Amino acid sequence: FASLSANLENCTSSKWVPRGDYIASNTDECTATLMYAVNLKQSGTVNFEYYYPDSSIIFEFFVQNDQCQPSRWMKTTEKGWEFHSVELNRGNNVLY
Amino acid sequence: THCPAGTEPAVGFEYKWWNTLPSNMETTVLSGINFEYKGLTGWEVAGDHIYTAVGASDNDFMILTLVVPGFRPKEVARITFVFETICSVNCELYFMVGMNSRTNTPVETWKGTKGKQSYTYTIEENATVSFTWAFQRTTLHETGRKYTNDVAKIYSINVTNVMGGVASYCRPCACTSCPAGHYINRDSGTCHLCPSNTILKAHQPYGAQACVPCGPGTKNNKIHSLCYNDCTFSRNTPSRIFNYNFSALAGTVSLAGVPSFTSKGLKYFHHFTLSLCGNQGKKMAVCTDNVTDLKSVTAYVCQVVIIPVSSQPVSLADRLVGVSTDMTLEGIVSPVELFHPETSGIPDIVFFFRSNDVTQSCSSGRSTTIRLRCNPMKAAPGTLRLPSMCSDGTCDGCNFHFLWESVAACPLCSASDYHTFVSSCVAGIQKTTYMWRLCSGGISLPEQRVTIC
Amino acid sequence: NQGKKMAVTAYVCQVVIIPSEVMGYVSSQPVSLADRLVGVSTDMTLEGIVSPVELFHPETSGIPDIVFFFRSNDVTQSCSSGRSTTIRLRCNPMKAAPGTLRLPSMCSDGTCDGCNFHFLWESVAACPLCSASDYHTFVSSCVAGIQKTTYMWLCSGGISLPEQRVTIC
Amino acid sequence: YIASNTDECTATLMYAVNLKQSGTVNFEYYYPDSSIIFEFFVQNDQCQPSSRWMWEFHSVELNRGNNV
């Protein structure tokens, strides 16, 4: 995992922090990207549980594909943690 | 006791005691550590007041959710709470409102220890609304339930215009809805009309006490919901009568300040949509949440801050205060020290429109001040310039003020205003030419005429 | 600037620029438009060069419009006669700004002629310097022992507005 | 050879090759006129920029990632 954090236009100290059993997003105004570069040898999917408490902070989960070629926004979650899943191809997909 | 047939059938919720928990409200615990529904008993009734019970940890949220399906007939429902907090530190009351079963949004979030107070909320439109009061004893996480003193007391809950509820109090009525402009009155026995230039309030039905006359320089709307501005103000002066015109200012304008960087690199700038008058009292200047679509507030002046987008919309002009050239009107003044002295030098005009919403930061409520000026060199139909000292206009905290300059703002000059340059009868010739000496519009410039002497 | 054409060096510079943000960052096709001076006068024609006055709207003031001519030395296949630039000068009283240069509406690019590039400039200073007898006279005559002499004004600058004086009749 | 588009249109020639070892790319490019600009870069395994602009001879360095 690469926890790249950059100012959108210091927030370098603000990034996705491993809070505990769950990771936590930065509360302040900055772009904190959590990126994973995994080479899927077979067609597969990704299943992760995401908590969306408030609409103040937006959540984006797009897996850029093998050629770097790129519905990205995740809807709000109420009550439970909810469940998300997208399809992935055989290319070197890089989750963000 | 049975409500009299004269009074309208009104049903409301009032729980001054908690010997028996109302069926509408249910208790639930969300553990702070794992952010999952524990299914515990968050709040324990004490007969008189309801308080937060101790769960697995004090960081866990104590949720008490009350759900109403609809509202029985933009302040259709005014819910009022009496919250008393004996909490010590890290005391949050996440009062959330779900409009039409949407994601819960915290309208107000009190912080720290607070005494008993009354808070009112506005339901913009009829829908399913759930009031959830979330309490967190401590923001920091510590092992053990060492903090049970932090308990929030809510011993009074009042809900207005509820569907399928008990009739805790019945409001009066004459029972058909009187036409707009007629105050509902039960003792009179017939639909009685309010006096002219008066607006009636529906919150207090009986009598004309809620029917309040309009302010200076205003006209009543046919609906009597809010006063209307004629856009032409006429005041008396010893020299003559001054008739300031603002007809061209009815249309909305888009003026925003320079972007300002935050503590971080993010930048923002405030943009207000101002509708001075006209449109038969319709305040259609609304700010929506376009960024959310990837709500809207109706007011003459609309507040929205947009980043390089559409967020934080709050109404600024809901109730009309008054319209006159005097600085003060109903105890509301504008920061004239920020506005530069005008070049023309005529007495400046100021318009006042106060928003109904009251927040913690604005105890007196949101009152909006609009300063009107006239400048001869402003050949454009309108040049709205923001105050230089307060670029955002929020330096006062509750008074948002802009500066408008246009040629039409000058008073309508009378007949004797134009300078006279009539020539006298010498050598058998005389010339009579008239031209203006601050005048606006009026009769055209009279032409010269020749006559023998 | 003592004849210095620092705006290629020419009084009028031609450059078409694409948006820089669309490209991802712009300055291309530079050609001089004003290398040789043709003439300066209010007449439409000067040394066989005229401006498309039909494109320019009639001015509000109504005074005879001024036109400046500066021809570029470069000669191309498309422009056999060479590049000649025409600049139309106008004066408008309501133009309180120091200068408002407005492009011709009919020819937005200004290259419809093929060799004549024309813009329209409007400013208060373009009006002629009015003489002494220009301001309107409104002197009052001697009746009842009182007379008033007040003078007031298309004029530009000049002597300040004279003040009124009182004298017995 | 392969020819670029003479139009004012963004046409990209992309190759996604997985280098099991660090290596280089050696290609010959012709630049007759400056009207059409040439851009050649390598994007590493985390889609990321690893200079950008350019019969002559050209060569750049590549990493062990899935260079594109």
Ligand SMILES: *[C@@H]1O[C@H](CO)[C@@H](O[C@@H]2O[C@H](CO)[C@@H](O)[C@H](O)[C@H]2NC(C)=O)[C@H](O)[C@H]1NC(C)=O
């Ligand atoms: C919602 O409305 C539009 C939709 O994109 C955006 O604001 C306008 O964007 C257009 C496109 O450049 C501009 O020409 C307009 O000037 C913008 N409106 C204003 C008032 O400046 C934006 O996404 C959202 N804007 C608002 C005000 O909600």
Ligand SMILES: *[C@@H]1O[C@H](CO)[C@@H](O)[C@H](O)[C@H]1NC(C)=O
């Ligand atoms: C800029 O960012 C660096 C990186 O964390 C930080 O150490 C520094 O304090 C920042 N500068 C500020 C906050 O002025």
Ligand SMILES: *[C@@H]1O[C@H](CO)[C@@H](O)[C@H](O)[C@H]1NC(C)=O
């Ligand atoms: C809520 O307060 C209003 C304020 O006048 C009152 O009229 C109403 O009766 C109250 N609600 C109940 C259920 O009593």
Ligand SMILES: *[C@@H]1O[C@H](CO)[C@@H](O)[C@H](O)[C@H]1NC(C)=O
């Ligand atoms: C309010 O909306 C609810 C549905 O959300 C509906 O059942 C109810 O009838 C509405 N109240 C009216 C129309 O007065």
